[PDB]
Amino acid sequence: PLRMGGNGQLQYWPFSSSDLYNWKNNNPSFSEDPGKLTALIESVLTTHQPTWDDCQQLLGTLLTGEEKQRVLLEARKAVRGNDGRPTQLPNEVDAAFPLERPDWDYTTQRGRNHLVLYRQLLLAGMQNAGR
Amino acid sequence: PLRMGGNGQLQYWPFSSSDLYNWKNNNPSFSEDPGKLTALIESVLTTHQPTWDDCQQLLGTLLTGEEKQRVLLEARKAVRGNDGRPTQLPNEVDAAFPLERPDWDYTTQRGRNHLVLYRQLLLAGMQNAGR
Amino acid sequence: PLRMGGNGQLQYWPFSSSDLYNWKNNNPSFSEDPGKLTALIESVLTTHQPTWDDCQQLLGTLLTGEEKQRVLLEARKAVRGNDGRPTQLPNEVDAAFPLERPDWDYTTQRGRNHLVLYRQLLLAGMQNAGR
Amino acid sequence: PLRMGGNGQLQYWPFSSSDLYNWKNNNPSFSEDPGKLTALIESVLTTHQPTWDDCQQLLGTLLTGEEKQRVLLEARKAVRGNDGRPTQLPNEVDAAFPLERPDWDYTTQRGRNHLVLYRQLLLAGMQNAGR
Amino acid sequence: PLRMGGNGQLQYWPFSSSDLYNWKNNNPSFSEDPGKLTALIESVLTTHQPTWDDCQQLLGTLLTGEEKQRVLLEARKAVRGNDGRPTQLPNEVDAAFPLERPDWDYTTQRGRNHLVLYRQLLLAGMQNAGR
Amino acid sequence: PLRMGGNGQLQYWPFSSSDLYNWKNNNPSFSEDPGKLTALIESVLTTHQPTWDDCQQLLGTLLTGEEKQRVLLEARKAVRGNDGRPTQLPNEVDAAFPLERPDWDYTTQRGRNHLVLYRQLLLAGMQNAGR
Question: Can you summarize the PTM annotation of this record (chains A, B, C, D, E, F)?
């Protein structure tokens, strides 16, 4: 998670495992009722401002292997080029929604913008995988 | 939640899931007995000074979709104009009780003021929805 | 709760729900054995230095509605005037033990003094209600 | 509890109820096996550097009313006059081991000295009450 | 765990036992399904930035002695020289993946670089042992 | 526990009871399988840098009275003198592995060194008692 520190600088801390497991245990599986976890994750993406690694823990903990895969491919399918249209260009897809750890630095506007987009695409992925 | 920090400045931390689920598990549903969750949320709105996002999280966890919709509707119906009378002017309803994430900056007096009003309206909404 | 922070600043944090429910679960009800919760709350009023809102949360959680109302009624009957003698003057009663949220600021000496007095009266009210 | 802060300034924080109840739940009653809670409290008196209020809370949670009264009685019997010999003079007994909240300020050397003595006497009291 | 604070200060805190045991309790053994604990540990290596001591504690808690010994053996088999080439010269293996506590200092680039390398080799070791 | 602050000053905090009881509850007794608790304590001695008092809580919580006494006996039997050779001279044994609370100031070289030695001897005691 990230939060704005008292000094005007973002501050990082890892998710407590109790939160992750509580979220899991108080909801149906994604397959049973996708709306439940999707709404929970949409909320957390905002309040907890997760990094890319944090998102991997969210997904890894709340979804099964098969569910996560569906979501990730759905998220990559939601990437748009600069012309606002879908794109399947590897470099564009990889840049927006990387499958391997990116070098995004949350102390930079560049890093922050990628994080914003990543979270937006993650949500889209879940919404579409649910449907 | 927001709390005043060491430098007389508001600091933010997300709700602990243990608190949210403890609140859920120790009270009847809103439909079952609205007074209990209403009183709890009234209290939490003050002690935890939640942001707009926190409020969506609080509500989404403690109320069903059906219940929350009812609550948000009553809240918007309780908005008053500068003449102390009910107002249905969309711009005024939306400015006081937005249904989508507003740009309220809690470090500013204006955002702080919007948050106090949002919380009062939410409470009025729960009270009215309860009746 | 309030505590003296590291910059000679009084610092606020909300009660943990785990503490509130643990206190309820490990004691008989106020009606069953008033002495137990009275002693617990007496202690907490000092160790946790609760604000007026904290006190409402505390009482609202540990006492039933009828119990709480009895306690507040008795607290208000235990107000004294500036001569140190009992008073029933509504203005002195409302100033020392408001039933609605006061404008008390814990960063001011006046607010702090009001809080010390409010907690003292709350204890008196619990003792008298118990008896 | 008290701990030395960064600048050698003691900082106060109240006991977590989870610690108090875990200690209770993982030991026999004082009456069943005095040495158990005695050793636990002895240790806490050092690691947590409790204030007078903390001590009341610790004893009030872990001992029954009757057990606690016996401990406080034995503690008071262990008070010594300035000559290092037993004293039963009420002014001396009350200054060293007050039954009512004293005005000790842990930010002063004298308040600190009073607390050290109080804890020492409390341990003696438990030891002797145990016998 | 290590986290970055203020304006760049690394800060150490030991793992919470609740986290370690939750991780253990919500996953199959390494021998039953290596990919699960592997993915979890890989994630933790990044989010919690564990020291060498932390890594021993993490492995010791989540893997049996046999499993842990296999992982460390494989990590050591995957050591490379500074030039990127594989090496099994004893001194270079020991420098990159020590079996005994090293004197790495996280306030120096040399220390931080050693820890980053250790975690990388640990991951490789788990993957290989898993295979 | 002790940890290093950014300014190089050690900072003390007491063990959470949740950690101590979790350690106890997730492991066999020392008499059952000495290796388990021994390894656990070995790890805690490093990550948590416990003081003498902390070590008493670890031992007193994780071991039975008989086991603890046996561990302390073995630790004291393992003491070495100024020559690095074994010694059983009372003053040297009591200085290295005191049974009563010592005056070790962790801000001094001498105090830190006594602590490191105490922890090493505690581990030796456990290993030897296990055998």
Answer: Sumoylated; required for virus replication.
Which chain E residues contact residue F48 at CB under 8 A? 14
Closest by CA position to C95, among listed C121, C127, C63? C121
Strand (E) or helix (H) holding B22: helix B17-25
CB C40 within 8 Å of CB C32 = no
How far is the alpha carbon of B73 from chain C, nearest alpha carbon, in Å?
A: 26
| Plot region of F59 (φ>0 → left; ψ -120 to 50 → alpha; else → beta) | alpha
Measured CA distances, F126 to C69, F37, F76, F130 (Å): 58, 9, 11, 6
Where along chain D do its domains lie?
Answer: 1-131
Question: What is the torsion angle, in degrees rounded to the nearest 10, for the CA atoms of residue B28, residue B30, residue B32 and residue B33?
Answer: 80
Q: How far is B105 from chain A (nearest CA, A)?
A: 12
Contacting chains of D (3 CB pairs or more, <8 Å) are C, F
Subunits with 3+ C-beta pairs closer than 8 A to E: A, F
Out of B13, B18, B53, closest to residue A18 by CB = B18
Strand partners, C2: C12
CA C36 to chain centre: 16
Contacts of A25 (CB under 8 A, 6+ apart): none
Q: What is the CATH number of domain B1-131?
A: 1.10.375.10
Angle at alpha carbon of residue C93, lines to C92 and C98, rounded to 5°: 115
The vertex-C80 CA angle with C78 and C81, nearest 5°, equals 155
Which one of C11, C12, C19 makes the best mutation probe of the D interface by having the most chain D beta carbons within 10 Å? C19
Q: Do D39 and F60 touch (CB under 8 A)?
A: yes
Q: Which residues partner with A86 through β-bridges?
A: A80
Residue whose tokens read 């748009």 = A80
Which residues of chain E make contact with F43, given a CB cutoff of 8 A?
A: 53, 56-57, 60
Q: Can you name the residues that pair with E11 across neighbouring β-strands?
A: E3
The residue to which tokens 């990559």 are assigned: A76
Q: Which residue has the tokens 């801000």?
A: F107
Taking only Cα atoms into account, the Rg of chain A, rounded to an integer number of angstroms, comes to 15
Residue type present at position A88: Q
Query: What gap in Å lies between CA A69 and CA A31, rounded to an integer?
Result: 13
Return the beta strands (E) in chain A as ranges: 2-4, 10-12
CA distance F98 to A80: 69
The data reach a resolution, in angstroms, of: 1.9
Q: What is the CA radius of gyration of chain B?
A: 15
H or E element: which one contains C3?
A: strand C2-4
E99 Cβ neighbours under 8 A, 6+ residues apart: E72, E76
Q: CB–CB of F115/F51 below 8 Å?
A: yes
Contacts D16 to F, Cβ<8 Å: 16
**What token pair was written down for D107?**
């930010």
- Output the CA angle A107-A49-B69, nearest 5 degrees: 150
Residue B1 CA to chain centroid, in angstroms? 12
Token readout for E7 is 């304006």
**DSSP 3-state assignment of F60?**
helix
Yes or no: say if F20 and F115 are a contact pair by the CB < 8 Å rule: no
